[PDB]
Nucleic acid binder design. Structure first.
Ligand SMILES: [Cl-]
Ligand SMILES: [Cl-]
Ligand SMILES: [Cl-]
Ligand SMILES: [Cl-]
Ligand SMILES: [Mn+2]
Ligand SMILES: [Mn+2]
Ligand SMILES: [Mn+2]
Ligand SMILES: [Mn+2]
Ligand SMILES: [Mn+2]
Ligand SMILES: [Mn+2]
Ligand SMILES: [Mn+2]
Ligand SMILES: [Mn+2]
Ligand SMILES: [Mn+2]
Ligand SMILES: [Mn+2]
Lengths: 77, 104, 91, 96, 92, 108, 84, 99
DNA sequence: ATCAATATCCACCTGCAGATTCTACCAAAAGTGTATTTGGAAACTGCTCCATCAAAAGGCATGTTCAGCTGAATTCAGCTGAACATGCCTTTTGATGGAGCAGTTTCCAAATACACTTTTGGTAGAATCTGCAGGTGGATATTGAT
DNA sequence: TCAATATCCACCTGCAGATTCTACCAAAAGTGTATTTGGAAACTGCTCCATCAAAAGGCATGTTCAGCTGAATTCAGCTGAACATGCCTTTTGATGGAGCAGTTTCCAAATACACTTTTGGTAGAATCTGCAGGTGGATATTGAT
């Protein structure tokens, strides 16, 4: 569902990162990396959600999952 | 009279004390601890809002938005270190293009 | 019900920049920031008191925690304003 | 007929997207990706819209940062084109 | 001047897995350090878990969720197994 | 009075359930501690210690020694994927590193 | 007492070479030794500054191993082996 | 009979094997101790150290430099060199978040 | 290095949709006053370790020479990725019900706290035990050759 | 293949360090009672999900070719290898004696608890400012000299 992360969107992300020329193999690699990231984050968020005997993952569950991976996110308290 | 009034602070000393008591940090909480902690939190908030207002002025605007917070934090040595692993939603990045990528 | 620091951040904003406002998203970022620094400081102070077999977190723990968590000039000015507030409060 | 030289449009885009803050992935493809990955943990879960948005902010900040590090790795090798081996070096050194 | 440590328990486990094998005191300090570190990690995660849900009690189920959050994969799976077994045996 | 039976014995554990309970109580984690929490926690600490001591003992045998030293603990941890991530940011004093030479450094 | 000066130079070129060899380094630029001294001094100052802060908080004059272990831990570099 | 001589790098590779096989501290003890005390005295005069505090510092420092030299070496190899240079160290520390 | 042509950028503008403030009420939080307890600071003191110094052995740092091989610079081409035009389809935007979650509230059975007493596992130190630190010597492996 | 050099891999024994034992006692266990809390039952709004559609604007595709990456080639100078020399680290040991820990006493500072006053949170109504998109150049770039 990964392929729905378009080549143009990845180019946009690369441009915000200051990248001027992109090899053709970056896109699949980028998707793989994004996928690992997402699984790790979501795996923890849902764990928090199940501990609270909820069926809705909340913004605070995602903030806790991020934080515990050393990636504090501001704006969603 | 609120304790915040007696300390000369805007941040809420009583709330900081309740939060310390309710956080399982220690069994007892001294009287000076929430005053000291509220003073520090206020000072840091003032520093950041100072810089963010200056940045929002540089861009000719009146409402501080997340972008000015990101600009304020990343262009300052010590705050950028304090918030080193922090992501500011809607903040973007600092404009920075490696010299070797430019023509000439 | 649902707490935040918005009113206080707003007061500090009108202190440093009388004419400037702040969006609700920027205010949410400020709220997350205040909660983050609070947790860092309180948690260090908690570890400090445990290391020294003490059951009370006093202003002296908050000060040491600030010295450990803040960089350089920020630590100096934070210790300064904390001492200032505590002395003003004691009267 | 008028045509820009390779890289002039690239630098225009770098400036435009480094000055801005909008999300760069479209929302619905991302929401579907999020929901699929979640379904592989506990089906029939629900998401606050703000939870999906927090995920999107986290992912984009992560990939943009990773691309800064990758770009420096490429330039280190006296290139201007990022390649998978640059991504891999950046993640190996980051400890990922 | 009494000083507690996990040394005797680490040693009993050593005699369990490698009966004829010993351990140097520097390695014993490493194992003590490891026990204290994982204790703090788990206890801290469980404390936060209870705090997030406005609960005053840390139960075995907070310990369980903490285990699932901090340990990798098969390690977490087998640890959940041994923790459940101990609690069920202790209750009866 | 009832004949005293340790909680670790009734849990079937080698690690001390009572001490783990005391440590949770005096560590200011929550105001209350359920009776099952120290049992589960001691079980987990014992399981992980057993895992590491297993792998470290094998490493000590491979190098023809009978007493485990820090080097064997380091070899055990860095050669096992899951322990290596769990202890990813941990330094084992006197542990050394794993032998590893990037291929391109070797002669033709 | 006795004045301690320039002890950064006691990290010899041969010792830095040994550390790099343990890191798998086969060839070392001549400018690496001074850079290594700079980076080591920054690292050490950060660790020792936090260790001393713990020592001052406990109103002691002796840096203990636990002070160094706490300073390390809070900098994200946990060290095993020096508890108790 | 021309005197015996190893080709450049053969001894370097032997040293890599010998030192990656061992765990002894690689900096001399007394110079490291003086460095620690000098840095500490410039923070609070007349401090004392438990010997194990100094040894913990030395273990910490050596592990850190060995880890950073692994990362530096990968940076050099990435640039198709075999000689580590300051720009490799600087790249490694920028990416690690250390600068 | 200029030049005119072409394409995208960027101040400047204005009304109004939507975001930020006025309005007003109110649980819960914060403050107050009084009573009672207690953690830890102060002042001692014994006694570990810590600092310092010494000798002396010999390991290792230092300083030098010099050649191999590496990094740096330069040239060239083939192939890859940028730009662009084109037109199709995925996303955005908005709506629509309404199923089904969160979030509350009450109330007892079950759980946990915690003081006192009894018991026993855990520690410190003494007393045994024993791998392995080093030291030695040949086998093997590798290296670089002329 | 050979000479030189280094590493590998058993063998040996005393003793520094580990293991075992012993006895004291601190803390866990048992017990009894007081206090807190979790969940079964019963609610009630209110968020999300499912579903449908129009249509906007973003993406996929295919061609051309600019220029980047990697290979090839050359050279000079730096860094590795080898050696002598002798400094200073290591080791072992002793000595004062600083200052950790261990104790004791006793208040300044904390908790407890009843009661009162204030305020931050909340939701709607009533006002203000960034944003849609336009315009109008104006700024930068490009091929051609
Ligand atoms: Cl205080
Ligand atoms: Cl690649
Ligand atoms: Cl429990
Ligand atoms: Cl360099
Ligand atoms: Mn000095
Ligand atoms: Mn009372
Ligand atoms: Mn007392
Ligand atoms: Mn080369
Ligand atoms: Mn061509
Ligand atoms: Mn007994
Ligand atoms: Mn040996
Ligand atoms: Mn007693
Ligand atoms: Mn109000
Ligand atoms: Mn606009």
């Amino acid at each position: 569902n990964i392929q729905g992360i378009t080549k143009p969107a990845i180019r946009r992300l690369a441009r915000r990162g200051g990248v001027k020329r992109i090899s053709g193999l970056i896109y699949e690699e980028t998707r793989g990396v994004l996928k690992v990231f997402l699984e790790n984050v979501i795996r923890d968020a849902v764990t928090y959600t199940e501990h609270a005997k909820r069926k809705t993952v909340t913004a605070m569950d995602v903030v806790y999952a991020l934080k515990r991976q050393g990636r504090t996110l501001y704006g969603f308290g | 009279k609120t304790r915040s009034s007696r300390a000369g602070l805007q941040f809420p000393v009583g709330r900081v004390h309740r939060l310390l008591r309710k956080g399982n940090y220690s069994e007892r909480v001294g009287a000076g601890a929430p005053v000291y902690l509220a003073a520090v939190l206020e000072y840091l908030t003032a520093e950041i809002l100072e810089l963010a207002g200056n940045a929002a002025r540089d861009n000719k605007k009146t409402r501080i938005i997340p972008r000015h917070l990101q600009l304020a934090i990343r262009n300052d040595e010590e705050l950028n270190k304090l918030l080193g692993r922090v992501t500011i939603a809607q903040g973007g990045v600092l404009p920075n293009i490696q010299a070797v990528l430019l023509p000439k | 019900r649902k707490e935040s620091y918005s009113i206080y951040v707003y007061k500090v904003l009108k202190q440093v920049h009388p004419d400037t406002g702040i969006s609700s998203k920027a205010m949410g970022i400020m709220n997350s920031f205040v909660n983050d620094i609070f947790e860092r400081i309180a948690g260090e102070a908690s570890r400090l008191a445990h290391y020294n077999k003490r059951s009370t977190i006093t202003s002296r723990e908050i000060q040491t925690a600030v010295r450990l968590l803040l960089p350089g000039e920020l630590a100096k000015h934070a210790v300064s304003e904390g001492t200032k507030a505590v002395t003003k409060y004691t009267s | 007929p008028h045509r820009y030289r390779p890289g002039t449009v690239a630098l225009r885009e770098i400036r435009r997207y480094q000055k801005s803050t909008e999300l760069l992935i479209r929302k619905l493809p991302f929401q579907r990706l999020v929901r699929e990955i979640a379904q592989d943990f506990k089906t029939d879960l629900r998401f606050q819209s703000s939870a999906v948005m927090a995920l999107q902010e986290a992912c984009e900040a992560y990939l943009v940062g990773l691309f800064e590090d990758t770009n420096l790795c490429a330039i280190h090798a006296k290139r201007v084109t990022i390649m998978p081996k640059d991504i891999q070096l950046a993640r190996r050194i980051r400890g990922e």
